[PDB]
Amino acid sequence: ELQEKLIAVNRVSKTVKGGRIFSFTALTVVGDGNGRVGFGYGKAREVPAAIQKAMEKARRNMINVALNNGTLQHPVKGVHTGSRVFMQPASEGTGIIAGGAMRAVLEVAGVHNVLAKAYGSTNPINVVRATIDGLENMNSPEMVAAKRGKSVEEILG
Amino acid sequence: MLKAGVHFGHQTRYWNPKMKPFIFGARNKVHIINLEKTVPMFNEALAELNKIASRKGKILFVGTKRAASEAVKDAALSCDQFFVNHRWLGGMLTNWKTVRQSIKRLKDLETQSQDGTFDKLTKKEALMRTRELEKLENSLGGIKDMGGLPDALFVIDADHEHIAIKEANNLGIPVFAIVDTNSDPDGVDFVIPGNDDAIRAVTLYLGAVAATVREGRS
Amino acid sequence: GQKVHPNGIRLGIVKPWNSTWFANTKEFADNLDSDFKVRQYLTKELAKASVSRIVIERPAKSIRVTIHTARPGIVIGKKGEDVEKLRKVVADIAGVPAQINIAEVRKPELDAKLVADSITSQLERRVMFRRAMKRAVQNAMRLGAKGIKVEVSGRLGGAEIARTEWYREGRVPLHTLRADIDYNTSEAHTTYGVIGVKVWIFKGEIL
RNA sequence: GGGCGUAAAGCGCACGCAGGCGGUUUGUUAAGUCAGAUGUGAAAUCCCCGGGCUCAACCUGGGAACUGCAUCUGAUACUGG
RNA sequence: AAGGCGGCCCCCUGGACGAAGACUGACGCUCAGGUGCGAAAGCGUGGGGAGCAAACAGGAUUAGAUACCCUGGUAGUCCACGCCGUAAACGAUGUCGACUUGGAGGUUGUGCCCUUGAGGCGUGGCUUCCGGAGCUAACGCGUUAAGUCGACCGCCUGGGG
RNA sequence: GCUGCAUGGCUGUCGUCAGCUCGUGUUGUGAAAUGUUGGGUUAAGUCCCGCAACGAGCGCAACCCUUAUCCUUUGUUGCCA
RNA sequence: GCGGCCCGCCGUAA
Numbered sequence: 001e002l003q004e005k006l007i008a009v010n011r012v013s014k015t016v017k018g019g020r021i022f023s024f025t026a027l028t029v030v031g032d033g034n035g036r037v038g039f040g041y042g043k044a045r046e047v048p049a050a051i052q053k054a055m056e057k058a059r060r061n062m063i064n065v066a067l068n069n070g071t072l073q074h075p076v077k078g079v080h081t082g083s084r085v086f087m088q089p090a091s092e093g094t095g096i097i098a099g100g101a102m103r104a105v106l107e108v109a110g111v112h113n114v115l116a117k118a119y120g121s122t123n124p125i126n127v128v129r130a131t132i133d134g135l136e137n138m139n140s141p142e143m144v145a146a147k148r149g150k151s152v153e154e155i156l157g
Numbered sequence: 158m159l160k161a162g163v164h165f166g167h168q169t170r171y172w173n174p175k176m177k178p179f180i181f182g183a184r185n186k187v188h189i190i191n192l193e194k195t196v197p198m199f200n201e202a203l204a205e206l207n208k209i210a211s212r213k214g215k216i217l218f219v220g221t222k223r224a225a226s227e228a229v230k231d232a233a234l235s236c237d238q239f240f241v242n243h244r245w246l247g248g249m250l251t252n253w254k255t256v257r258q259s260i261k262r263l264k265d266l267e268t269q270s271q272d273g274t275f276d277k278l279t280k281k282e283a284l285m286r287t288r289e290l291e292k293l294e295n296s297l298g299g300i301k302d303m304g305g306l307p308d309a310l311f312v313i314d315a316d317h318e319h320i321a322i323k324e325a326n327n328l329g330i331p332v333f334a335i336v337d338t339n340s341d342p343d344g345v346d347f348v349i350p351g352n353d354d355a356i357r358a359v360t361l362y363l364g365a366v367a368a369t370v371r372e373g374r375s
Numbered sequence: 376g377q378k379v380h381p382n383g384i385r386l387g388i389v390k391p392w393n394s395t396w397f398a399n400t401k402e403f404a405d406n407l408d409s410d411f412k413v414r415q416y417l418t419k420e421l422a423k424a425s426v427s428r429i430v431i432e433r434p435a436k437s438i439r440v441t442i443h444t445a446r447p448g449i450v451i452g453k454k455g456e457d458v459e460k461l462r463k464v465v466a467d468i469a470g471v472p473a474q475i476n477i478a479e480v481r482k483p484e485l486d487a488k489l490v491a492d493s494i495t496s497q498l499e500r501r502v503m504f505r506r507a508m509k510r511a512v513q514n515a516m517r518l519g520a521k522g523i524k525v526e527v528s529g530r531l532g533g534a535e536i537a538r539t540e541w542y543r544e545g546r547v548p549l550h551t552l553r554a555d556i557d558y559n560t561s562e563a564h565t566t567y568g569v570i571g572v573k574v575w576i577f578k579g580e581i582l
Numbered sequence: 583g584g585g586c587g588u589a590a591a592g593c594g595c596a597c598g599c600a601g602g603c604g605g606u607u608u609g610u611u612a613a614g615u616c617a618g619a620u621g622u623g624a625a626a627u628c629c630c631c632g633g634g635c636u637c638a639a640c641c642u643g644g645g646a647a648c649u650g651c652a653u654c655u656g657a658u659a660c661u662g663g
Numbered sequence: 664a665a666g667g668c669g670g671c672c673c674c675c676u677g678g679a680c681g682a683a684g685a686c687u688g689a690c691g692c693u694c695a696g697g698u699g700c701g702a703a704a705g706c707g708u709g710g711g712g713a714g715c716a717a718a719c720a721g722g723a724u725u726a727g728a729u730a731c732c733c734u735g736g737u738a739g740u741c742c743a744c745g746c747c748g749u750a751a752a753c754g755a756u757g758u759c760g761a762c763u764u765g766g767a768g769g770u771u772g773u774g775c776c777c778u779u780g781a782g783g784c785g786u787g788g789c790u791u792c793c794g795g796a797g798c799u800a801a802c803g804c805g806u807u808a809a810g811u812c813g814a815c816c817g818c819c820u821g822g823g824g
Numbered sequence: 825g826c827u828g829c830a831u832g833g834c835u836g837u838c839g840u841c842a843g844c845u846c847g848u849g850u851u852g853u854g855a856a857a858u859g860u861u862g863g864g865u866u867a868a869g870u871c872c873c874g875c876a877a878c879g880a881g882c883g884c885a886a887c888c889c890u891u892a893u894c895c896u897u898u899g900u901u902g903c904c905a
Numbered sequence: 906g907c908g909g910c911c912c913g914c915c916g917u918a919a
Contacts, residue, residue, distance in 0.1 A: 012855065016844095025854095043856095045846095081800065081853050119583095121800095126853060174764050174795085247876030252849040255878050320876065323850090376835040388888060522881095530831055535919060537831060546881075553887050560833090568831045582887095584820100587756055587809070588802085591819040594701070594752045595665040598694080603814060605689070725909075732908100800853095829918100 004055060005029045005104045008124045009047060026050040027124060029101075030058040031108030037135075038062035039105075039128055063131065066140045070112035073141070078133020082121040085130045090115050101128045109135065158196060162361050164352040165190040166338030173341045179350045180338065188338045190350050202333055202347040203369050209309050210236075210373030218299075219245065219321055220313035225359045229313070232363040233299060236371035239307070240299035241321075250324040253305055259293065260301055266290045309333065311366060314353045316340035335362060381549060381558040381575065388552050389581050396433035406433070409469045413440070416468060420461070424449045427486050428478075438473045440465065445480035445489065484511075484518045487574035488559040494525070494572050495563035504531060504570075505540075512542055515576065522547040522577040529570035547577050555581050 007027040013020050024047050031037035040058030044050040066072060071089040078085050085102065090113035096106050098116035101124045106114055118127060145152045166172065166180075166188030181191040210216065218233045218240035220226075226242050233240035241249075249256055269276070270290060274283045310325050312318050312334035325332050326344040335349045342348045352358045382390065398406055410431050417429060417440075425445040432439045444450055451458055458475055466473040483489050490511050497507045508525050515523045522545025530537045548554050557576045562569050 014856080041854095123854095129853080170766065172765090177764090244875090246878065248849045248878060252876095252878065255848055258879070320850095327850095376833095384888090528832075533919085534830065536829085543881085548882085550883080551887065562832060564832095569833090571832050580887095586817105586819070587754085587804095589800100590821095591817105592755105592757050593817065594748105594750090596700075597664105597698075599697080601694080602816100603693085604691075726911095 002030055002032055002059070003108045004058075005108055006051065007101050007104055007128065009050075012043075024050050026054045027101075027128065028054040028058055029104055029108050029128065030055065030062075031105075031110065033108065033110045035067055035110050036062050036064045037105065037109045037131060039131065041125070063136050065109065065135045065138060066143075067109075067111060068140070070110070071114055072138050074134075074138050076134035076138055078130060078135075078137070080126045080129040080133060083123075083126045083129070083133075084119040085116065085127065085133050086119070087114055087116045087130075087134060089113070100124060102130055105130055105135075161192065163190070163192075163358040164355050166352075171339045173339060175341045176336070176338055176350075179336075179348075190338070190352070195350050198347065199349055199365075202349060203365060205331075205347065206309065206311075206333065206366060207369045207373045210370040212308075213237075213374070214308035215239065215303065216309045216311060216370060217241070217307040218311050219318055221245065222314060222317065222354070224354065224356065225313050225363075228356070228359055228363060230299065232367045235367050237374065238370060239303050242299055243295050245318065245321055246296065247320055248324070249300075250306070250328055250330075256297075257305070260297060263290070263293050263297060263301055266293070306330075313359060313362070314340070315342075315346075319343075322346075378549075381556050385552060385556070389555055393429070394431045396431075398433075409438075413438075413465055413468050416464065417442070417461070421450060425480070425483065425489055426450075427480055427488050433471075437471050438465075438469050439476070440473065441476040441478055443478040443480055443486075445483040447477045447479060451477055482518055484514045485520065485557070485576055485578065487557045487576050488561070490515065490525075490576075491559055491561035491572045491574045494527075495561045495570075498563045498570060499565065508540070508542055512544070516544065520576060521545050521579060522575075524575045526573050527570060530567045531570070532567065545577065547575050549575075551580070553580055553582065555579055 005028060007029065009024060009026050012023050012025055014023070023043055023045055025041065025043050026047070027039070027041055028051070029037065029039045038058045038061040040054040040056070040061060042050045042053035042057060044053055073089060075086075075088040077087070087102075092113060094113045094115070096103055096111065096114055096116075098106060098114065099118050100122065102116050102118060105128060106116065121127075141152050141155055145155045148155070166183075168187050169183055172180075172188060179191060179194065181189040183189055206216070216238045218229045218238060220229045221241065221243050229240050230242050246256070266286070267290065270287075273286065277283065306328070308330065310321065310330060310332050312321060312332060315322065315334045315336045316339065318334075322332055322334065322344045332344050332346045333349070334344070334346050335351055335353050336342055336346070337351070337353050349362075351362070386392065394410055396406065413431070414429050418426065421442070421444075426442060427445070428443040430441045430443075432441075442450065458477075462473055462475050465475070480486055480489070494507050494511060498504060504527055508527065512523055512525060522543070524541060524543035524547050526539065526541035528537060528539045547556070549556065555578050557574075557578065559574060561572045563572070
């Protein structure tokens with residue numbers, strides 16, 4: 001039922017007394033298409049082993065977000081080590097226009113219309129944090145009403 | 158309650174500033190624990206432990222400190238519960254899958270033990286097997302007959318057993334540690350202020366818990 | 376060149392010979408040559424079957440041959456006509472009269488010769504070597520064995536230096552003489568030269 | 583809508599004119615700021631609702647836009663006198 | 664203020680801090696151009712000259728040794744009066760103001776309590792070392808911020824050339 | 825006949841030196857780390873104790889041959905109290 | 906505690 005995606009694979013080395021030994025890494029994202037998403041990162045001597053090792057690590061690590069008809073009502077921005085991300089809601093008919101790993105994250109998450117953009121550095125591992133960057137720090141009107149001790153209808157007005 | 162059979166903090170220079178709400182005035186160079194706000198928290202913790210025991214939750218006891226060892230081993234094995242007495246192994250809970258093999262080896266070794274030297278008289282091998290069993294039993298004696306993944310943990314010293322608390326938080330199991338002045342409430346805890354090195358104090362702590370749990374089954 | 380041959384080192388401990396007969400200096404070479412000729416002919420003729428091991432024993436004025444195989448029906452045929460053709464040719468090769476026997480291989484996933492030449496046959500049809508290796512190791516572990524190691528060497532498609540790979544799990548102790556290790560090799564001729572295959576199987580330690 | 587400990591980047595350190603920026607009330611002014619109204623901001627071009635060339639480039643009807651300027655009336659929380 | 668300042672005594676002179684009380688009534692902050700002060704070496708005129716010592720001369724070592732090592736040795740280093748205006752002139756961190764969990768010291772004031780004693784309670788200034796949240800590419804910083812903010816100024820825009 | 829720099833198979837060498845890795849779990853954004861480090865021992869990652877690690881694999885050792893001491897069995901072509 | 910001892914042609918595994 002869950003959707004799985006593969007983002008990037010690269011070869012990584014290490015030096016010992018006799019020479020060099022190589023290894024591979026994989027970055028994957030998993031979502032339910034409805035508001036739950038997680039990611040994982042695995043290493044092994046062979047590509048298939050790393051691929052399969054990232055998946056269940058992603059499965060055990062999930063969070064839920066609160067969208068609304070395919071987005072929510074926040075222009076939100078998030079950061080990690082050297083990456084900035086900007087996402088804002090789109091009206092309708094539009095797609096998931098977004099550059100790299102943001103495309104896969106927003107696709108598996110369940111968003112259908114968004115106007116993302118990426119700044120700063122763009123390596124996949126840190127920009128994938130776009131999950132934790134802003135997706136789960138998003139506020140629905142009902143929880144805002146609960147926090148401020150009021151009712152939704154006059155919070156919106 | 159009223160007997161005040163529990164002493165108080167270590168010293169004003171070894172203290173965690175997060176313990177200010179529970180602290181009292183300090184007079185003789187050491188901090189004093191306020192008992193006026195410990196009874197309600199203790200009663201709430203006791204009620205929660207009773208309702209968990211009624212759910213046959215397989216409570217767990219820890220607290221290796223060379224002073225509460227026999228105390229926790231006697232409080233446990235009394236009603237129905239298990240305990241950890243020596244050398245909390247890093248990853249009993251997150252890596253329970255591997256620890257099951259050690260438990261199984263202990264079970265096989267003890268089954269063979271009741272008729273051990275009859276199988277073979279090579280005294281070297283018999284002696285080394287006995288030594289291996291003795292080494293293995295203490296680290297898992299209290300947990301051998303457990304299904305796995307208990308539903309509650311009772312911890313005597315908080316900062317001294319931070320690895321167990323981290324494992325419990327990672328798995329998502331409620332904790333019932335006792336916090337002193339030089340420790341801090343970090344995990345999802347039912348915080349119970351009080352001294353943790355006095356024999357009278359620890360005995361008073363464990364007696365109420367044992368009575369509550371042994372009542373909870375019926 | 377570092378490893379002693381696993382089969383040879385154990386020939387007097389836990390392993391038997393394949394040719395068992397007595398002779399003197401006059402006929403030693405002739406007996407060896409005859410055994411070589413008959414083994415070569417049998418291997419050439421019975422390629423399509425699954426032949427594993429040929430044991431040759433010389434009765435006083437006679438030669439006795441036993442064949443181990445996993446599909447005896449093909450070798451023995453509808454009636455005993457094909458075994459009779461084989462017996463005629465063998466008795467032609469060696470002057471003395473000959474008799475033939477057939478042995479039965481119960482678990483073809485053991486007896487490393489079968490695994491090795493199965494992998495070679497797969498390689499001859501241009502299939503990825505890694506899948507073959509993993510398939511064989513998984514089958515052998517499923518059927519029950521304390522360990523197995525396979526390896527392949529040669530020009531695996533790339534013009535670069537011929538590479539080497541190997542997989543292993545279980546236990547394969549090679550420095551203990553009590554252990555019962557079965558070892559055999561094979562090689563496959565492709566469009567880019569030959570590829571070598573080696574298999575170790577650890578059936579079980581013997582007291 | 584970027585930076586300056588080590589990647590490029592804090593004057594060797596002070597005093598100080600012109601400039602830039604001002605703690606708390608009260609009272610007046612309406613300069614800044616805000617709201618209306620009028621007069622202006624050519625046509626063509628862009629946009630919206632339409633129309634006609636077999637359709638489309640093309641032509642055409644009406645409306646918005648021309649982020650501005652000046653004048654008059656009003657408001658007085660904030661900045662200025 | 665920075666560059667810097669160490670035997671002892673006298674004369675002239677600047678700043679900082681504390682206690683208590685009185686007084687004036689926003690008189691403030693920053694600062695392009697401008698002005699002043701800046702280690703050592705160096706320059707000019709006149710003195711002085713013990714030790715040390717660029718340049719220089721011999722003796723060694725070395726394949727060579729215009730060097731490191733040894734024996735000497737001039738300018739200079741010192742004083743007075745004028746120039747020069749640069750340093751890894753570094754905490755490699757501009758100046759003011761406000762706010763935010765803690766420990767262990769050093770130095771200099773002052774209030775109270777038996778002031779008994781090297782006692783106990785406080786309350787200011789200036790300084791070392793750990794470390795929490797937070798911040799950072801990381802190292803690390805961490806109430807004397809590289810944390811959360813405001814005012815003004817100075818600089819940066821690939822490496823060589 | 826050419827190409828050991830297109831290869832299989834088979835050898836030398838570091839070196840009979842004591843090392844070389846993996847599964848799961850934790851730490852770090854990451855290359856990686858931990859285990860394999862520390863105290864005492866051994867010919868030896870050989871062993872005890874400690875310790876966010878808990879267990880495995882190839883190595884070391886043992887199982888093989890010969891030599892040194894006795895006991896049974898057999899006694900020629902071997903032996904003579 | 907201090908005696909001396911310099912160099913290594915051009916490109917080149919995936």
